[PDB]
């Protein structure tokens, strides 16, 4: 019969209040013989009714995919509320339930440090700026780079790694054209994490 | 049966002994049968094949059925950069040194911190991460007492990789 996957919001969406975090319950392998699907949603076991369910969409393998999207409150997600999606379909012997929530554990604040390039690399046409993010918990985080209020997306970020004290660390580095750096343009590392004051901090660097 | 490669430093340093390890035995180098596999007795089992550094590095295939070999692809030399602590972090009694290693292929590498001939405690090194151009990158972070940093002690990031000259480079830093 059908199967169910339940997807959490992305951390940046739960962390910036102007953004729109959603939980998404997806049902696949819905047959033609029994195409009707019903969703019941619960937040800490209490039924909610504000989900937006899309009509069924036939896939190229001749089964339907049915999607329901629950809008969450940012504070609810961050306070560890459990979101349950129950899926009924007449081909099932019983409804399928799936539950998700934010990673448990005592939040710890990242400290963020930016590191300017080496001289060695400055004899190439690109250069590396490093953002060192340390001491955070849980691992959920967003790290992004920007310049002049706009994204600088030519970066890589290490996945979070466990230190010996139980908290996480990572590095992000941004590859910029060397002329841009020499010209004195300011680059900024933006870190979004539930344990930061206002869930956001930015650290900036430029040449001297 | 699950077959394991040698570790990076073992293939790159000629004084070390690289081994392929077949855990749970026949053994083959590029199809041909070999008979130097020291097996050791089952424990409520593992077989070890000592390999030649150059055979591993030339891409020979080791068969135990699972086969293993070095990752295929043109080797690319790592670039190594070191960063002193942020002046912001200097307000704490621990500070961080960063060694940034980028543009290498294959992923097999050893990136280690040392001072005065000896390994440094309290470091963390990421497993290598795939970049857009097909190469790999990683960072290694050493945490030291501000005391040692400010006193002018010299810290070194040693990197061992097949595409380096002598399979080795060392980049050091200290206060100004
Ligand atoms: C018929 O066709 C069906 C549809 O497929 C089309 O695909 C083509 C390639 C082609 O084949 C077409 O013909 C075909 O029609 C097909 O359906 C598929 O069924 C699979 C199961 O058989 C499903 O596999 C699962 O996928 C999960 C990951 O899925 C995401 O990733 C894929 C890969 O890119 C993507 O295609 C999916 O759509 C899905 O995308 C996510 O979508 C959500 C929601 O929209 C996004 O989240 C939202 O994003 C918005 C902004 O857009 C906003 O940010 C919201 O807030 C946010 O919620 C995600 O961003 C997006 N993610 C991406 C892109 O990465 C796997 O996780 C899952 O793995 C689990 O289950 C396995 C068993 O099935 C198990 O072995 C595995 O270990 C794992 O187990 C889980 O472990 C977790 C933690 O470790 C636990 O949390 C779980 O409890 C645990 N689960 C267990 C044990 O069960 C799984 O592999 C596939 O998704 C589905 N495809 C689609 C499109 O729905 C069908 O199978 C076909 N049938 C036949 C018979 O062929």
Short mmCIF file of C-alpha atoms and ligand atoms in Angstrom, two decimals:
data_model
loop_
_atom_site.label_atom_id
_atom_site.label_comp_id
_atom_site.label_asym_id
_atom_site.label_seq_id
_atom_site.Cartn_x
_atom_site.Cartn_y
_atom_site.Cartn_z
CA UNK A 1 0.00 0.00 0.00
CA UNK A 2 0.89 3.72 0.28
CA UNK A 3 3.80 4.97 2.37
CA UNK A 4 4.31 8.26 4.18
CA UNK A 5 7.25 10.65 4.62
CA UNK A 6 7.13 13.66 6.93
CA UNK A 7 9.59 16.52 6.44
CA UNK A 8 10.59 19.18 8.98
CA UNK A 9 10.97 22.90 8.32
CA UNK A 10 14.44 24.15 7.35
CA UNK A 11 16.34 25.82 10.20
CA UNK A 12 16.54 29.24 8.60
CA UNK A 13 12.72 29.21 8.30
CA UNK A 14 12.20 28.35 12.02
CA UNK A 15 14.77 30.96 13.04
CA UNK A 16 13.75 34.12 11.11
CA UNK A 17 10.19 35.16 12.10
CA UNK A 18 9.42 36.76 8.67
CA UNK A 19 10.03 33.41 6.97
CA UNK A 20 7.43 30.65 6.73
CA UNK A 21 8.38 27.23 8.27
CA UNK A 22 6.22 24.32 7.31
CA UNK A 23 5.98 20.63 8.03
CA UNK A 24 5.21 18.59 4.88
CA UNK A 25 3.51 15.19 4.89
CA UNK A 26 3.90 13.35 1.62
CA UNK A 27 2.06 10.16 0.63
CA UNK A 28 3.29 8.01 -2.29
CA UNK A 29 2.15 4.79 -3.98
CA UNK A 30 -1.52 5.79 -3.72
CA UNK A 31 -3.33 3.35 -6.04
CA UNK A 32 -5.98 4.05 -8.69
CA UNK A 33 -8.32 1.48 -7.05
CA UNK A 34 -8.26 3.40 -3.73
CA UNK A 35 -7.20 6.97 -4.59
CA UNK A 36 -8.87 8.82 -1.65
CA UNK A 37 -6.44 10.06 1.00
CA UNK A 38 -7.30 11.87 4.25
CA UNK A 39 -4.85 13.72 6.53
CA UNK A 40 -5.31 14.32 10.25
CA UNK A 41 -2.71 16.58 11.89
CA UNK A 42 -1.79 16.89 15.55
CA UNK A 43 0.49 19.18 17.57
CA UNK A 44 1.39 17.50 20.89
CA UNK A 45 -1.57 15.12 20.37
CA UNK A 46 -4.13 17.94 19.93
CA UNK A 47 -5.83 17.90 16.49
CA UNK A 48 -5.19 20.96 14.29
CA UNK A 49 -7.17 21.86 11.11
CA UNK A 50 -5.10 24.59 9.41
CA UNK A 51 -3.17 22.28 7.00
CA UNK A 52 -3.25 22.97 3.26
CA UNK A 53 -3.70 19.74 1.35
CA UNK A 54 -3.09 19.68 -2.40
CA UNK A 55 -5.10 17.56 -4.83
CA UNK A 56 -3.56 14.21 -5.76
CA UNK A 57 -0.99 14.25 -8.59
CA UNK A 58 -0.47 11.22 -10.80
CA UNK A 59 3.17 10.18 -11.13
CA UNK A 60 4.84 8.63 -14.16
CA UNK A 61 4.58 5.17 -12.50
CA UNK A 62 0.73 5.33 -12.44
CA UNK A 63 0.38 5.97 -8.70
CA UNK A 64 -0.56 9.27 -7.02
CA UNK A 65 1.46 11.52 -4.77
CA UNK A 66 -0.58 13.54 -2.23
CA UNK A 67 0.96 16.37 -0.24
CA UNK A 68 -0.30 18.19 2.87
CA UNK A 69 1.48 21.24 4.30
CA UNK A 70 1.14 22.33 7.94
CA UNK A 71 2.18 25.90 8.74
CA UNK A 72 4.01 25.84 12.13
CA UNK A 73 4.58 28.63 14.61
CA UNK A 74 8.28 29.36 14.95
CA UNK A 75 8.07 29.33 18.75
CA UNK A 76 6.17 26.05 18.78
CA UNK A 77 8.87 24.32 16.65
CA UNK A 78 11.68 25.74 18.80
CA UNK A 79 9.90 24.75 22.07
CA UNK A 80 9.95 21.14 20.96
CA UNK A 81 6.32 20.57 20.00
CA UNK A 82 5.75 17.23 18.25
CA UNK A 83 3.97 17.34 14.87
CA UNK A 84 2.06 14.19 13.88
CA UNK A 85 0.64 13.41 10.42
CA UNK A 86 -1.97 10.62 10.29
CA UNK A 87 -2.80 9.26 6.83
CA UNK A 88 -5.94 7.21 6.06
CA UNK A 89 -6.44 5.37 2.75
CA UNK A 90 -8.84 2.47 2.12
CA UNK A 91 -5.96 0.18 0.92
CA UNK A 92 -4.40 0.37 4.42
CA UNK A 93 -5.38 -2.08 7.18
CA UNK A 94 -4.78 0.86 9.58
CA UNK A 95 -3.82 4.52 9.32
CA UNK A 96 -0.12 5.34 9.09
CA UNK A 97 1.17 7.89 11.61
CA UNK A 98 4.52 9.73 11.52
CA UNK A 99 5.76 12.26 14.09
CA UNK A 100 8.60 14.77 14.02
CA UNK A 101 10.12 17.45 16.21
CA UNK A 102 13.22 19.47 16.70
CA UNK A 103 16.40 17.73 17.89
CA UNK A 104 16.41 17.48 21.72
CA UNK A 105 19.14 18.78 23.98
CA UNK A 106 20.19 21.85 25.86
CA UNK A 107 20.88 24.71 23.44
CA UNK A 108 24.41 26.11 23.43
CA UNK A 109 25.44 29.39 21.74
CA UNK A 110 27.87 29.39 18.79
CA UNK A 111 30.86 31.70 18.96
CA UNK A 112 31.75 32.95 15.47
CA UNK A 113 35.16 34.06 14.27
CA UNK A 114 36.25 35.25 10.79
CA UNK A 115 39.79 34.66 9.49
CA UNK A 116 41.30 36.78 6.64
CA UNK A 117 43.32 35.11 3.83
CA UNK A 118 46.95 34.05 3.90
CA UNK A 119 49.54 35.97 1.89
CA UNK A 120 50.54 32.70 0.10
CA UNK A 121 47.12 32.39 -1.54
CA UNK A 122 46.99 36.16 -2.37
CA UNK A 123 49.36 35.37 -5.28
CA UNK A 124 46.36 33.66 -7.02
CA UNK A 125 43.24 35.11 -8.74
CA UNK A 126 40.97 33.84 -5.91
CA UNK A 127 41.33 34.04 -2.11
CA UNK A 128 39.72 32.33 0.96
CA UNK A 129 37.90 33.93 3.89
CA UNK A 130 37.11 31.61 6.79
CA UNK A 131 34.22 31.64 9.19
CA UNK A 132 34.86 29.44 12.26
CA UNK A 133 31.65 28.52 14.13
CA UNK A 134 32.22 26.71 17.45
CA UNK A 135 30.48 25.45 20.56
CA UNK A 136 26.88 25.10 19.33
CA UNK A 137 24.12 22.70 20.18
CA UNK A 138 21.96 21.30 18.79
CA UNK A 139 23.61 20.86 15.32
CA UNK A 140 20.79 22.74 13.47
CA UNK A 141 22.23 25.93 12.03
CA UNK A 142 22.48 28.06 8.88
CA UNK A 143 25.70 29.74 7.79
CA UNK A 144 25.64 32.07 4.79
CA UNK A 145 27.89 34.69 3.27
CA UNK A 146 27.08 38.10 1.95
CA UNK A 147 28.53 41.34 0.68
CA UNK A 148 26.79 44.75 0.30
CA UNK A 149 23.48 43.29 1.58
CA UNK A 150 23.52 40.54 -1.09
CA UNK A 151 24.34 36.87 -1.01
CA UNK A 152 27.84 35.64 -1.87
CA UNK A 153 27.13 32.03 -2.66
CA UNK A 154 30.60 30.73 -3.75
CA UNK A 155 31.24 29.09 -0.38
CA UNK A 156 31.55 25.67 1.21
CA UNK A 157 30.60 24.81 4.75
CA UNK A 158 31.84 21.83 6.76
CA UNK A 159 29.07 19.67 8.26
CA UNK A 160 28.81 20.20 12.03
CA UNK A 161 31.37 18.17 14.00
CA UNK A 162 31.26 17.03 17.62
CA UNK A 163 33.92 18.54 19.90
CA UNK A 164 35.18 16.74 23.05
CA UNK A 165 32.83 18.89 25.26
CA UNK A 166 29.59 17.61 23.54
CA UNK A 167 28.98 20.72 21.39
CA UNK A 168 29.36 21.21 17.60
CA UNK A 169 31.84 23.09 15.38
CA UNK A 170 32.17 23.91 11.68
CA UNK A 171 34.01 26.11 9.22
CA UNK A 172 32.73 27.90 6.16
CA UNK A 173 35.01 29.49 3.66
CA UNK A 174 34.15 31.86 0.85
CA UNK A 175 36.19 31.91 -2.37
CA UNK A 176 36.21 35.50 -3.77
CA UNK A 177 37.98 37.06 -6.77
CA UNK A 178 41.26 38.54 -5.46
CA UNK A 179 40.61 41.96 -7.01
CA UNK A 180 37.34 42.24 -5.06
CA UNK A 181 39.22 41.56 -1.79
CA UNK A 182 42.07 43.94 -2.67
CA UNK A 183 39.56 46.64 -3.61
CA UNK A 184 38.36 46.64 0.08
CA UNK A 185 34.87 45.14 -0.25
CA UNK A 186 33.40 43.94 3.05
CA UNK A 187 32.40 40.31 3.33
CA UNK A 188 30.19 38.97 6.12
CA UNK A 189 29.52 35.59 7.68
CA UNK A 190 25.90 35.29 8.85
CA UNK A 191 25.03 32.60 11.36
CA UNK A 192 21.50 31.66 12.36
CA UNK A 193 21.10 29.43 15.43
CA UNK A 194 18.33 29.06 18.05
CA UNK A 195 20.70 29.92 20.97
CA UNK A 196 21.96 33.21 19.56
CA UNK A 197 20.39 36.44 20.82
CA UNK A 198 17.73 37.15 18.14
CA UNK A 199 18.77 33.84 16.53
CA UNK A 200 21.24 35.74 14.35
CA UNK A 201 24.77 37.05 14.45
CA UNK A 202 26.97 38.47 11.70
CA UNK A 203 30.73 38.81 11.63
CA UNK A 204 32.47 40.89 8.97
CA UNK A 205 35.94 41.30 7.52
CA UNK A 206 37.84 43.40 4.99
CA UNK A 207 41.43 44.22 4.04
CA UNK A 208 43.74 46.64 5.81
CA UNK B 1 33.01 -10.07 4.12
CA UNK B 2 33.98 -6.36 4.24
CA UNK B 3 37.31 -5.12 2.84
CA UNK B 4 39.28 -2.10 4.14
CA UNK B 5 42.02 -0.03 2.44
CA UNK B 6 45.33 1.05 3.97
CA UNK B 7 45.44 4.33 5.82
CA UNK B 8 46.86 7.44 4.16
CA UNK B 9 50.18 7.77 6.01
CA UNK B 10 50.92 4.09 5.54
CA UNK B 11 50.90 4.33 1.72
CA UNK B 12 52.76 7.64 1.66
CA UNK B 13 55.63 7.04 4.08
CA UNK B 14 58.05 4.37 3.02
CA UNK B 15 59.02 3.44 6.64
CA UNK B 16 55.37 2.50 7.35
CA UNK B 17 53.50 -0.68 6.36
CA UNK B 18 50.30 -0.34 4.32
CA UNK B 19 47.88 -3.21 4.62
CA UNK B 20 44.58 -4.23 3.06
CA UNK B 21 42.36 -5.86 5.75
CA UNK B 22 39.63 -8.42 4.84
CA UNK B 23 37.31 -8.91 7.87
CA UNK B 24 34.33 -11.23 8.49
CA UNK B 25 40.42 -16.26 2.39
CA UNK B 26 41.96 -16.10 -1.07
CA UNK B 27 43.74 -12.91 -2.19
CA UNK B 28 44.56 -11.39 -5.60
CA UNK B 29 46.62 -8.47 -6.98
CA UNK B 30 45.16 -7.47 -10.40
CA UNK B 31 43.68 -10.95 -10.85
CA UNK B 32 46.86 -12.92 -9.93
CA UNK B 33 46.92 -15.05 -6.74
CA UNK B 34 49.19 -13.97 -3.84
CA UNK B 35 50.35 -15.85 -0.73
CA UNK B 36 51.72 -13.47 1.90
CA UNK B 37 48.36 -12.85 3.61
CA UNK B 38 48.91 -13.34 7.35
CA UNK B 39 45.59 -14.64 8.69
CA UNK B 40 44.97 -14.59 12.48
CA UNK B 41 42.58 -16.94 14.34
CA UNK B 42 38.81 -16.44 14.71
CA UNK B 43 37.49 -14.65 17.80
CA UNK B 44 34.06 -15.12 19.38
CA UNK B 45 37.88 -13.41 11.80
CA UNK B 46 40.35 -11.15 9.94
CA UNK B 47 42.97 -11.56 7.16
CA UNK B 48 45.72 -9.00 6.53
CA UNK B 49 47.59 -8.44 3.27
CA UNK B 50 50.71 -6.29 3.38
CA UNK B 51 50.87 -4.24 0.16
CA UNK B 52 53.59 -2.34 -1.66
CA UNK B 53 53.28 1.42 -1.41
CA UNK B 54 53.75 1.90 -5.13
CA UNK B 55 51.28 -0.84 -6.16
CA UNK B 56 48.54 0.86 -4.09
CA UNK B 57 49.43 4.25 -5.55
CA UNK B 58 49.53 2.89 -9.14
CA UNK B 59 45.92 1.70 -8.80
CA UNK B 60 46.36 -2.08 -8.50
CA UNK B 61 43.19 -3.90 -7.42
CA UNK B 62 43.10 -6.10 -4.31
CA UNK B 63 40.51 -8.89 -4.27
CA UNK B 64 39.51 -10.99 -1.20
CA UNK B 65 34.09 -11.42 -3.08
CA UNK B 66 34.99 -7.74 -2.51
CA UNK B 67 37.65 -5.81 -4.47
CA UNK B 68 39.24 -2.56 -3.30
CA UNK B 69 41.64 -0.06 -4.86
CA UNK B 70 42.68 3.56 -4.62
CA UNK B 71 40.10 6.08 -5.86
CA UNK B 72 40.46 6.67 -9.61
CA UNK B 73 41.18 10.13 -10.93
CA UNK B 74 44.01 12.48 -11.76
CA UNK B 75 45.80 13.36 -8.57
CA UNK B 76 45.65 17.04 -7.52
CA UNK B 77 48.03 18.67 -5.04
CA UNK B 78 46.56 20.14 -1.84
CA UNK B 79 46.98 23.83 -1.11
CA UNK B 80 47.59 24.46 2.59
CA UNK B 81 46.81 27.68 4.48
CA UNK B 82 47.08 28.51 8.19
CA UNK B 83 45.22 31.17 10.16
CA UNK B 84 46.11 32.73 13.52
CA UNK B 85 43.42 33.33 16.18
CA UNK B 86 40.87 36.14 15.81
CA UNK B 87 41.58 39.11 18.05
CA UNK B 88 38.00 38.55 19.32
CA UNK B 89 38.90 35.04 20.56
CA UNK B 90 42.04 36.46 22.31
CA UNK B 91 39.76 37.60 25.15
CA UNK B 92 39.48 33.86 26.14
CA UNK B 93 42.11 31.61 27.75
CA UNK B 94 41.89 29.14 24.81
CA UNK B 95 42.46 30.26 21.18
CA UNK B 96 41.99 28.51 17.83
CA UNK B 97 44.47 27.97 15.01
CA UNK B 98 43.06 26.86 11.65
CA UNK B 99 44.74 24.86 8.89
CA UNK B 100 42.74 24.97 5.64
CA UNK B 101 43.55 22.28 3.09
CA UNK B 102 41.90 22.55 -0.34
CA UNK B 103 41.95 21.38 -3.97
CA UNK B 104 43.19 17.80 -3.39
CA UNK B 105 42.48 14.53 -5.15
CA UNK B 106 42.07 11.76 -4.15
CA UNK B 107 40.50 12.37 -0.70
CA UNK B 108 43.17 10.29 1.14
CA UNK B 109 45.19 12.70 3.20
CA UNK B 110 46.71 13.21 6.63
CA UNK B 111 46.55 16.65 8.11
CA UNK B 112 48.04 16.91 11.62
CA UNK B 113 49.12 19.56 14.11
CA UNK B 114 52.50 19.58 15.86
CA UNK B 115 54.80 21.82 17.84
CA UNK B 116 58.53 21.19 18.55
CA UNK B 117 58.66 17.70 17.03
CA UNK B 118 55.56 16.37 18.82
CA UNK B 119 51.82 15.96 18.03
CA UNK B 120 49.53 18.67 19.58
CA UNK B 121 46.56 17.61 21.71
CA UNK B 122 43.11 19.25 21.33
CA UNK B 123 42.67 19.41 17.54
CA UNK B 124 39.75 18.42 15.35
CA UNK B 125 39.93 17.62 11.64
CA UNK B 126 36.92 17.18 9.32
CA UNK B 127 36.64 14.26 6.98
CA UNK B 128 37.38 15.63 3.43
CA UNK B 129 34.39 17.32 1.67
CA UNK B 130 33.71 17.27 -2.08
CA UNK B 131 33.95 20.69 -3.79
CA UNK B 132 32.30 21.73 -7.07
CA UNK B 133 35.37 21.21 -9.27
CA UNK B 134 35.67 17.49 -8.18
CA UNK B 135 38.51 18.10 -5.69
CA UNK B 136 38.33 17.85 -1.87
CA UNK B 137 38.80 20.23 1.07
CA UNK B 138 38.91 20.16 4.86
CA UNK B 139 39.85 22.20 7.88
CA UNK B 140 41.75 21.26 10.98
CA UNK B 141 41.34 23.36 14.13
CA UNK B 142 43.84 23.37 17.01
CA UNK B 143 42.86 24.77 20.42
CA UNK B 144 45.80 26.01 22.49
CA UNK B 145 46.22 28.12 25.61
CA UNK B 146 46.50 31.85 24.84
CA UNK B 147 49.65 31.68 26.99
CA UNK B 148 51.47 29.41 24.54
CA UNK B 149 50.35 31.46 21.53
CA UNK B 150 51.36 34.82 23.01
CA UNK B 151 54.79 33.52 24.12
CA UNK B 152 55.73 33.01 20.42
CA UNK B 153 55.63 29.17 20.30
CA UNK B 154 55.56 27.77 16.77
CA UNK B 155 52.71 25.56 15.65
CA UNK B 156 52.79 23.49 12.46
CA UNK B 157 50.22 21.92 10.26
CA UNK B 158 51.75 18.90 8.50
CA UNK B 159 50.04 17.54 5.43
CA UNK B 160 50.70 14.23 3.70
CA UNK B 161 49.22 13.53 0.32
CA UNK B 162 50.35 11.56 -2.76
CA UNK B 163 50.39 14.58 -5.11
CA UNK B 164 52.82 16.55 -2.86
CA UNK B 165 56.54 16.51 -3.50
CA UNK B 166 57.92 13.89 -1.06
CA UNK B 167 54.30 13.29 -0.14
CA UNK B 168 54.73 15.96 2.57
CA UNK B 169 54.48 19.63 3.32
CA UNK B 170 54.56 21.60 6.56
CA UNK B 171 53.10 25.07 7.18
CA UNK B 172 53.89 26.79 10.47
CA UNK B 173 52.71 29.87 12.30
CA UNK B 174 53.40 31.86 15.43
CA UNK B 175 52.82 35.36 16.82
CA UNK B 176 54.09 38.06 14.38
C1 LIG C 1 6.39 6.11 -7.97
O1 LIG C 1 6.91 7.43 -8.15
C2 LIG C 1 7.03 8.17 -6.91
C3 LIG C 1 7.45 9.63 -7.14
O2 LIG C 1 8.72 9.77 -7.80
C4 LIG C 1 9.23 10.34 -9.03
O3 LIG C 1 10.68 10.33 -9.04
C5 LIG C 1 11.38 10.11 -10.29
C6 LIG C 1 12.85 9.79 -10.02
C7 LIG C 1 10.76 9.00 -11.14
O4 LIG C 1 10.96 7.70 -10.55
C8 LIG C 1 9.28 9.26 -11.31
O5 LIG C 1 8.63 8.28 -12.13
C9 LIG C 1 8.64 9.27 -9.94
O6 LIG C 1 7.25 9.48 -10.13
C10 LIG C 1 7.94 7.42 -5.93
O7 LIG C 1 7.90 8.12 -4.68
C11 LIG C 1 9.11 8.04 -3.91
O8 LIG C 1 9.00 6.98 -2.99
C12 LIG C 1 10.20 6.76 -2.23
C13 LIG C 1 9.91 5.59 -1.32
O9 LIG C 1 9.84 4.43 -2.15
C14 LIG C 1 10.56 8.01 -1.44
O10 LIG C 1 11.85 7.78 -0.84
C15 LIG C 1 12.05 8.47 0.43
O11 LIG C 1 12.69 9.72 0.19
C16 LIG C 1 13.08 10.44 1.36
C17 LIG C 1 13.80 11.68 0.90
O12 LIG C 1 12.93 12.46 0.04
C18 LIG C 1 13.05 13.84 -0.39
O13 LIG C 1 14.21 13.53 -1.17
C19 LIG C 1 14.04 13.08 -2.52
C20 LIG C 1 15.42 13.09 -3.20
O14 LIG C 1 15.73 14.34 -3.85
C21 LIG C 1 12.96 13.88 -3.28
O15 LIG C 1 12.76 13.42 -4.62
C22 LIG C 1 11.63 13.81 -2.51
O16 LIG C 1 10.57 14.56 -3.14
C23 LIG C 1 11.84 14.38 -1.13
O17 LIG C 1 12.06 15.78 -1.31
C24 LIG C 1 11.79 16.52 -0.12
O18 LIG C 1 10.49 17.10 -0.20
C25 LIG C 1 10.16 17.78 1.01
C26 LIG C 1 8.65 18.05 1.03
O19 LIG C 1 8.19 18.70 -0.15
C27 LIG C 1 11.12 18.97 1.19
O20 LIG C 1 10.94 19.58 2.46
C28 LIG C 1 10.23 20.85 2.40
O21 LIG C 1 10.79 21.80 1.48
C29 LIG C 1 10.10 23.06 1.45
C30 LIG C 1 10.62 23.98 0.34
O22 LIG C 1 10.54 23.30 -0.92
C31 LIG C 1 10.25 23.71 2.82
O23 LIG C 1 11.65 23.87 3.14
C32 LIG C 1 9.51 22.82 3.83
O24 LIG C 1 9.51 23.38 5.16
C33 LIG C 1 10.13 21.42 3.83
O25 LIG C 1 9.32 20.56 4.65
C34 LIG C 1 12.59 18.52 1.16
O26 LIG C 1 13.47 19.65 1.04
C35 LIG C 1 12.89 17.56 0.01
N1 LIG C 1 14.17 16.90 0.24
C36 LIG C 1 15.18 16.73 -0.63
C37 LIG C 1 15.04 17.27 -2.02
O27 LIG C 1 16.20 16.15 -0.28
C38 LIG C 1 14.01 9.61 2.24
O28 LIG C 1 14.28 10.32 3.44
C39 LIG C 1 13.36 8.30 2.62
O29 LIG C 1 14.36 7.52 3.31
C40 LIG C 1 13.82 6.84 4.46
O30 LIG C 1 12.95 5.75 4.13
C41 LIG C 1 13.58 4.65 3.48
C42 LIG C 1 12.49 3.65 3.10
O31 LIG C 1 11.68 4.16 2.03
C43 LIG C 1 14.66 4.08 4.41
O32 LIG C 1 15.36 2.98 3.80
C44 LIG C 1 15.68 5.17 4.76
O33 LIG C 1 16.65 4.66 5.70
C45 LIG C 1 14.99 6.39 5.34
O34 LIG C 1 14.58 6.02 6.67
C46 LIG C 1 14.23 7.15 7.49
O35 LIG C 1 15.30 7.61 8.32
C47 LIG C 1 15.02 8.92 8.84
C48 LIG C 1 16.23 9.42 9.63
O36 LIG C 1 17.41 8.66 9.30
C49 LIG C 1 13.72 8.89 9.67
O37 LIG C 1 13.25 10.23 9.87
C50 LIG C 1 12.56 8.08 9.07
O38 LIG C 1 11.65 7.75 10.13
C51 LIG C 1 13.03 6.79 8.36
N2 LIG C 1 11.99 6.17 7.51
C52 LIG C 1 11.77 4.85 7.34
C53 LIG C 1 12.60 3.83 8.08
O39 LIG C 1 10.89 4.46 6.59
C54 LIG C 1 12.83 7.55 1.39
O40 LIG C 1 13.92 6.92 0.72
C55 LIG C 1 10.58 9.25 -2.34
O41 LIG C 1 10.76 10.43 -1.54
C56 LIG C 1 9.32 9.36 -3.19
N3 LIG C 1 9.45 10.46 -4.13
C57 LIG C 1 8.72 11.58 -4.09
C58 LIG C 1 8.99 12.61 -5.15
O42 LIG C 1 7.87 11.80 -3.25
C59 LIG C 1 7.42 6.02 -5.70
O43 LIG C 1 8.29 5.31 -4.85
C60 LIG C 1 7.29 5.30 -7.02
N4 LIG C 1 6.77 3.96 -6.81
C61 LIG C 1 7.21 2.89 -7.47
C62 LIG C 1 6.57 1.57 -7.16
O44 LIG C 1 8.11 2.95 -8.30
#
